[PDB]
Amino acid sequence: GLFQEAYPLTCASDPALLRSARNGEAHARETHFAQYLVYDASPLKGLAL
Amino acid sequence: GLFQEAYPLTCASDPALLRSARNGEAHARETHFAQYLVYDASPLKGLAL
Amino acid sequence: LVGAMDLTFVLPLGLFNPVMERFAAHAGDLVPAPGHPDPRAFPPRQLFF
Amino acid sequence: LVGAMDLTFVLPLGLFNPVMERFAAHAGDLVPAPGHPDPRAFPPRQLFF
Secondary structure, three states, rough: OOOOOEEEEEEOOHHHOOOOOOOOOOOOOOOOOOOOEEOOOOOOOOOOO | OOOOOOOOOOOOOOOOEEEEEEEEOOOOOOOOOOOOOOOOOOOOOOOOO | OOOOOOEEEEOOOOOOOOOHHOOOOOOOOOOOOOOOOOOOOOOOOOOEE | OOOOOOOEEEOOOOOOOHHHHHHOOOOOOOOOOOOOOOOOOOOOOEEEE
């Protein structure tokens, strides 16, 4: 309501490249030849969800 | 004002090459086939900025 | 006192990478079988989360 | 007592590396898909920070 902006998820476009994102932030690769990752920026970051 | 010197920032010429630098000092590569990184030297080194 | 939240999320479906982002992590990161074209180098049309 | 700072900074746009600094960290550090030119090898004209 204040910021009029929304937050991204842990999303990608490879099922392969997503599985790097379960180890942690600092070690998941973000791109590929034509593929990409979007790592979250949410208040779910330090949580168990 | 004392030194007539300015400081360098975390800076690269590839966005791919910058992503190595977010971990820390000793792991970040600098040079590539025609590319370069500038790892910062500031009073903001041990801070969250 | 049990309240609730309203978080909204953004997922991109079919974007494409810029010029300095179409690369690989290594020369042999995610390579398919010999005698088969690369299924990754096609433009993306899916998501996974 | 709440003071302020004046920190000037330096960023180089379009320089070029010397003779003994045009290499790669491996043979396959950042290679594009086969059958494509290398946007890495060209003299850089961008910055990112």
